[PDB]
Amino acid sequence: SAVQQKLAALEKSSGGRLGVALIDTADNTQVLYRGDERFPMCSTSKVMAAAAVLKQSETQKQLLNQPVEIKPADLVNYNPIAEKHVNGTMTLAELSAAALQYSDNTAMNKLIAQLGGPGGVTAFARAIGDETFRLDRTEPTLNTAIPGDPRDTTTPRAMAQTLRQLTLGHALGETQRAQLVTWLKGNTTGAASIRAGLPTSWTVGDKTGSGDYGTTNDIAVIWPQGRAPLVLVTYFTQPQQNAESRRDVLASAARIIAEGL
Numbered sequence: 001s002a003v004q005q006k007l008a009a010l011e012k013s014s015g016g017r018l019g020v021a022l023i024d025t026a027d028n029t030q031v032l033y034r035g036d037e038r039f040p041m042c043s044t045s046k047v048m049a050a051a052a053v054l055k056q057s058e059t060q061k062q063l064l065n066q067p068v069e070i071k072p073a074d075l076v077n078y079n080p081i082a083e084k085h086v087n088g089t090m091t092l093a094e095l096s097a098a099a100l101q102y103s104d105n106t107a108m109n110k111l112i113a114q115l116g117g118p119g120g121v122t123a124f125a126r127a128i129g130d131e132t133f134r135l136d137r138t139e140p141t142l143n144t145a146i147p148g149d150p151r152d153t154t155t156p157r158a159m160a161q162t163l164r165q166l167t168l169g170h171a172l173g174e175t176q177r178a179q180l181v182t183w184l185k186g187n188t189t190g191a192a193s194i195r196a197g198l199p200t201s202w203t204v205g206d207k208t209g210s211g212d213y214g215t216t217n218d219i220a221v222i223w224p225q226g227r228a229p230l231v232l233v234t235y236f237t238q239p240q241q242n243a244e245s246r247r248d249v250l251a252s253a254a255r256i257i258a259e260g261l
Helices: 002-014 042-057 092-101 105-114 118-127 156-167 174-185 247-258
Strands: 017-024 029-033 067-070 088-091 203-211 215-223 230-237
Touching: 002 017, 002 029, 002 247, 017 156, 017 247, 029 156, 042 092, 042 105, 042 118, 042 156, 042 174, 042 203, 042 215, 067 105, 088 092, 092 105, 092 174, 105 118, 156 174, 156 215, 156 230, 174 203, 174 215, 215 247, 230 247
Parallel strands: none
Antiparallel strands: 017 029, 017 230, 067 088, 203 215, 215 230
């Protein structure tokens, strides 16, 4: 299709490897580019950790209000929110919001610990029917994004389907689902990524990710005004370990997708 030729051309112009999955919930149609190739998730994995804690809260009704101590030893490489609460506490709700909306890496590690390790995050994926997602490491080493390394990867197709289920479907309870949506819509790190390729009138909830090998990711739910929502996953990685981020590639991929709907 025209869209796949334009995505291929975008990829060729960028020098990297681009993965795209769009789900149009209007007719359940899918648009895939390298849809079944593995990409390093980097921080887009934080959505699965937050959703796993949300699932726990369906039975532990007060779980999200549970305070968790932030100790200096907990701090890793990027902790914009956790830094503000060292030697104090944050609730699991606050850590989930921090992980999602500011991509706080300490917050993510606390969520992983709450789930009993990376295997507990992966287990949630399996429980909701995602057999592709795998979380193997904690922050910050899960971002190494080494070519060919299957650790901490998923595919665009798998992530799109799972993000659809978590936000638009009923993998989570009603209150949990709405909270996840509210968190994604309040993301602060996404202005230059998918959002930048879309009409300003459209509502977007997204989670970015970045890592080594110039890995630059964004996963999004999109609510166009007067139109069924879309799920869009854009993964991008590059052959040089020290390559710079290319959020413009994600904006451009989203623009090409928007041309046609």
